Amino acid sequence: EAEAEFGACGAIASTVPNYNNAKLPDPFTFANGTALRTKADWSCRRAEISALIQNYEAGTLPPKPPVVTASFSKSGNTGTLAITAGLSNSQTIKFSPTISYPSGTPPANGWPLIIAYEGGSIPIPAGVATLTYSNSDMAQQNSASSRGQGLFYQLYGSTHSASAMTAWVWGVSRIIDALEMTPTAQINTQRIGVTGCARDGKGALMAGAFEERIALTIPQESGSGGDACWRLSKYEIDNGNQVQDAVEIVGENVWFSTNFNNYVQKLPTVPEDHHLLAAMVAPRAMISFENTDYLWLSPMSSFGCMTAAHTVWQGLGIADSHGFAQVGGHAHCAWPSSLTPQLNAFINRFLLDQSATTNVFTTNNQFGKVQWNAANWITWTTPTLT
Ligand SMILES: *[C@@H]1O[C@H](CO)[C@@H](O)[C@H](O)[C@H]1NC(C)=O
Structure with a gap:
């Protein structure tokens, strides 16, 4: 209307x-x-x-x-x-x-x-250039003490409502603006990806979701506030998994707006969850990677959240543009070589224009004290959008 x-x-x-x-x-x-x-x-x-x-x-x-x-x-x-x-x-x-x-x-x-x-x-292939983005300089992220600190707030004001991660997105958008006006940087601005691990993986997901010039988004072990859903993580913590959840995360750092504090104890009233955040990448490409060795990352929540998000790509007829791979057996943010083929498939197809197949949606189901039951969380039937 x-x-x-x-x-x-x-x-x-x-x-x-x-x-x-x-x-x-x-x-x-x-x-x-x-x-x-x-x-x-x-x-x-x-x-x-x-x-x-x-x-x-x-x-x-x-x-x-x-x-x-x-x-x-x-x-x-x-x-x-x-x-x-x-x-x-x-x-x-x-x-x-x-x-x-x-x-x-x-x-x-x-x-x-x-x-x-x-x-x-992540291991970046030899034919792809790497831009090192100091997101912490753009918006600091030491703890709750960092609120409103960083270059972004030296422009917009320390009381500006943007969370640190939103400030980071703004910085990515300016980087792409800069690249598009700087031919001597020799970058193909139609083939830009984004990545980060842990708190920086939460950041990378936000960047791919909100900045539509990103062709491939790669969040690595992003956990709560990343590719996990708030509602599912609340279910995990109530059932004895020692996960990060909405209530703890807003006290730990400044990755979310201060307004979110008004909702962390009332998650059912929030008309979104991180499955919708991930779906904002569609119809562009994304593969996220998770690690079941750390219950802090909320493993079931990521699988269920990304399964829910995946229905958007399925409804758009492009299911293979969205991948998820969740395994155990390696240190946090250490890259396991067993996932390199899946990572390279997405990079090869979406950044290097190869005919690589990108059907990747796998978990080991090692979710601790809970299980994933899709019927308890997803109530919609995926339409075939015309
Ligand atoms: C409902 O909202 C959407 C988004 O703003 C809009 O496209 C649509 O036209 C709205 N429906 C009606 C009946 O106005």
């Missing part, structure tokens, strides 16, 4: 004041009760999901500011992309991510690139 004022998607909701659902919110029904039926409907539902996530847990994601400039220099195989961002009131900040390049002549359209939060913890 009200398309003449708001555009093609009309008056998307940012709140649902009467919501109360202990199971997972339905991806395929808008807040107003309209059912999704077409693939185009997904674009508008994703916009509504973005507004709901910002309202309840992420804070405000500012749009591109009126000043974004960039200069590039290179020494050896290392480029430095010096970025400046500024507001209409003259306030400016600067940050300078570095890029590690393969040697020699690039492909005609430039190197594919993975934006790696704090360098990431």
Whole structure:
């Protein structure tokens, strides 16, 4: 409704004041009760999901500011992309991510690139350039003490509602803006991925969800606040698994908005969960990786959450653009070589344009004191969006 004022998607909701659902919110029904039926409907539902996530847990994601400039220099195989961002009131900040390049002549359209939060913890293939993004500089993340601290807040103000992870997303968007105006960086901006591990994996998921120029999203062992769902993690903690959950996470750090504190004890009233956050990547590609050795990561919650999110790609007819691999037997953020084929399949297909098959959806079902029962959490029937 009200398309003449708001555009093609009309008056998307940012709140649902009467919501109360202990199971997972339905991806395929808008807040107003309209059912999704077409693939185009997904674009508008994703916009509504973005507004709901910002309202309840992420804070405000500012749009591109009126000043974004960039200069590039290179020494050896290392480029430095010096970025400046500024507001209409003259306030400016600067940050300078570095890029590690393969040697020699690039492909005609430039190197594919993975934006790696704090360098990431995945093996990046030799034909893909790596941009090291210091997300902690953009928004600090030591503990609850870090609230409102970081370069982002030196631009927008320390009381700005963006969570640290939303601030990190904004920084990624500026990096891509910079790359698109800097041909000498020799990056194929149509083949950019994002990755990070642990808290930086929560960050990478947020980046892929909210920044649509990311072609491939790779969250690694992101746990609670990442590819796990709040409702499922509450079920785990109530049944004796020592998981991270919504209540603890908001006291531990600043990855979520202060407003989320008002909902962590009332999760059924939140008209979203992280299955909808992950689904915001669709129709682009994502594979996330989880580790069952650490109950803190909430293993069942990630499997159930990603199974729920997967229904969006299934409804869009592109199930193989979304992968999930969950295994045990390795240290946190250590990369197990047994998963390298799955990682490379997604990188090869979505960043390197190879005909790799990307049907990856596997778990060992090692969930501790709980089991996954899809009927207790997913109530919707996946439509075939037209
Ligand atoms: C319900 O909301 C969606 C998203 O704003 C919109 O596209 C749709 O037109 C709305 N339904 C009606 C009947 O206005």
